[PDB]
Write a protein that binds this ligand. Sequence first.
Ligand SMILES: CCOP(=O)(COc1ccc(CCc2cnc3c(c2)C(=O)N(C)c2cccnc2N3CC)cc1)OCC
Ligand SMILES: [Cl-]
Ligand SMILES: [Cl-]
Ligand SMILES: [Mg+2]
Lengths: 405, 552
Amino acid sequence: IETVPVKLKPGMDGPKVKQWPLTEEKIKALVEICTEMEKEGKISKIGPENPYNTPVFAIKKKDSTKWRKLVDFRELNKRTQDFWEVQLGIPHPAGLKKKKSVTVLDVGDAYFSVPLDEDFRKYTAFTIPSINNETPGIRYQYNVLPQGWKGSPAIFQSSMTKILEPFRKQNPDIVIYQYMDDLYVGSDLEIGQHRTKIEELRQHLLRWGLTTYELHPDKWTVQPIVLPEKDSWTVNDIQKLVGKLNWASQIYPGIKVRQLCKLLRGTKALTEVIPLTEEAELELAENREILKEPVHGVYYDPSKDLIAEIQKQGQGQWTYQIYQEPFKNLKTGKYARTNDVKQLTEAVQKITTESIVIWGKTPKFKLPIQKETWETWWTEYWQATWIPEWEFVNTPPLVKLWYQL
Amino acid sequence: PISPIETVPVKLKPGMDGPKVKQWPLTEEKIKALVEICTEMEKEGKISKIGPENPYNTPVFAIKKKDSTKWRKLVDFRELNKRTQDFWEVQLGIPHPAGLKKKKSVTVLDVGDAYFSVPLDEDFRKYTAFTIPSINNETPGIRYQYNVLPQGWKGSPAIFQSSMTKILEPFRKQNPDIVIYQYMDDLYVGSDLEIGQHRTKIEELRQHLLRWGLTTPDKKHQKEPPFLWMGYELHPDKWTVQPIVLPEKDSWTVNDIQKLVGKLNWASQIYPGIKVRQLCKLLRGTKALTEVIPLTEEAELELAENREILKEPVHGVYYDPSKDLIAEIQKQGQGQWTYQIYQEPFKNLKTGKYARMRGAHTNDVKQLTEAVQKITTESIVIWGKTPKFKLPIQKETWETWWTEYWQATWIPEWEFVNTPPLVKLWYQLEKEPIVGAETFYVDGAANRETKLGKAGYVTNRGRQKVVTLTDTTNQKTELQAIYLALQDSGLEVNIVTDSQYALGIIQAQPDQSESELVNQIIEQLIKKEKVYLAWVPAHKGIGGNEQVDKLV
Ligand SMILES: CCOP(=O)(COc1ccc(CCc2cnc3c(c2)C(=O)N(C)c2cccnc2N3CC)cc1)OCC
Ligand SMILES: [Cl-]
Ligand SMILES: [Cl-]
Ligand SMILES: [Mg+2]
């Protein structure tokens, strides 16, 4: 094939990211995998004249017992964003979120059959560490398009198009979207018809590169901020209600509270019961009406980053909001059903997947957890071929409450 | 003496050209020593004479060696170094003794003339050019360049270590059972063979080394146990830290206390129970190095107890990968934690301590979990697996706290061990408003410019009270208001605040804090029999909130 030259944003040097500690079984796995990739010429060993590094991990392929190499190219991708977004970007179809069934397929094996621009390879350096630092790391770079680098799909773009043309021509009412290592394939077929068409697509893919799960996006609906309807009300109940509407009012135009406050008049005990008024009973219904709806006035700005906040609700339930501008929610939701980190990890991948389908973009996550706990454990349950950006926050206990139920 | 191994290609940083520093004029004897030294280096291949066509130069000097009458050349590579490409890091961590597989034999081999024994990229040599000035700078000086890795150049540690790795490689392949640790210009080589076969395998490794340009000591000259390395004393089947002496002093200076703490911290990886909190407190508001700091009675108590711990020599064991890894943690008080890691009780691979304060306010359950994360990471680094923990907290205490707390967590497999003090929760807030309990609506305020502030409460029983506060902050007063309400309330209380900031602090159920206020509140919360804490939005005309709002 023909090597397409690549360039970093002017000034920016390559990634010099430290390698996180790996358990023995993950190191062993990485050595097998890399010895085999080297034999096949996909990667080559490198000397100390290469100052760059990006982290590398081992994960178990989604539904499958078998170790897989996961390279963390978040830094490189950030430093390459001129290349994979502006020069050769993949357009994201608005029709994908519309389909009844979307299937995700790994097409990462595609990239290893294509050479990487030689003047770029040094930036793809990574290090397999050793236990207790008893031997120097084993160091490689890529000779072909690496998985996980946003440049790879940008470059392989015209090859993918040639591969998909027949299947696309024969099935016009099917949307296929490439994002990183995955192919998203949506249709409105009945589920058996949909699955059949995926297999045919696997065969097309098979004549080039692939081995020998289904979203239902148009069935995604927001998790409305929920206002209870109760038997009787206490003072405490009303205040908790006011605080909650008070918070919605900062997002949804038209939210009203005034009638409820009138109920609080005076300085009375917390458990006391208080009579329910028509003005309140109505205003309450009027608000509850607005929470069911899209936020009037909020719209996706393609130029701006996506952000996802996640609150631990307890009993295995998690809530989350996606926004570009704080409090202006493009999507809210919940994830449900062991282990606090295993669940958070599952919620992050699920939220990321939906983000890819809806916007073609991945969110920066605000994660309610100690950095070090997350760093240690996340790979133990991670199954995606990508890695979202994240930071760590202490959840405002009030935010948690307003998104209950 | 100059390895036949292929060179690492090297570059200057992309925008830059090689150094051009002017050679200062030297003395006659300095000039003489250098010509002597350089002639001997030139014969061995280390350096070469070059023409005047080479534009590059970096300064050389000579200083009399070790007070003796030997001279050492000394090249100043600061300028070339600033222009040389960045390299990859030699090591990203250093091995810990506790992580070493036990071996029947280990011998030490040092490489002689390590840097000078390794070639330098042909294309880069012209950048290492230096000039021995002629006397009084009358005539053109003598110009050489390096053919090998210079001492003091930026790339030499890294190109050396990688050259050796390339050389060791095939011998590793044919001897997969043999352990070789590369450290600077030492090799540590270890086997489970019997002396003779080991003696054999060594001289065979020496031989592979010599085919490659590397001279090593012979049997007569190879050093003996214990091996002293990285501040450790490594005997054949136990290890410890190198000898530690705690000075006797009538009085301590800043600098004395820093070195004390450095030694204690270092001793703490095998002497269990070391403490430095009270000594570190003295270091606060750091003054002059020479300054005398009188010891508090608590620092004196601490030094004394450390003194006893270090009284009798302790040692550590090496790692048997077939056995399991157990880790035990004990509370030592005031955010201080100590741990031991063994495989067979109670023979420690290593020990440690954890003191860190993550946050301004915490409780023991949070600190214990943080200490577990720390020890887990350390275990992954050192042994490549997580230990089985034995923790001083009930499965129910921990279950209760972490299911209810808003942050996620997950410690590896642990089990409870009864090693007081146990970690417990000292109070729990209530889930529901309390019937029959007085409801306090509290509030606080601080004038941003005057910094003066009022704090107080209003009650459903008509009670009321407000106080004045000098030089405080809006945050400080809102905690004052909550504290007031606790002091003046009975054993059961509802409290209503509009401070998310106070709520957050209290909701998380701290049992220790840097704020004295927050410790006072904590004393109160523990003495109470029931507290329910609620939040209302400010300035919304909510009930009692507005009353106390204007009051303050
Ligand atoms: C002539 C026969 O040998 P010998 O002179 C003494 O032999 C010893 C000395 C120490 C140990 C401790 C474990 C032990 C195991 N591995 C070690 C070491 C010690 C060690 O000393 N260091 C410095 C080290 C540092 C970092 C990474 N790896 C190591 N290695 C690599 C082999 C074991 C054997 O007589 C013994 C028959
Ligand atoms: Cl779904
Ligand atoms: Cl000193
Ligand atoms: Mg040394």
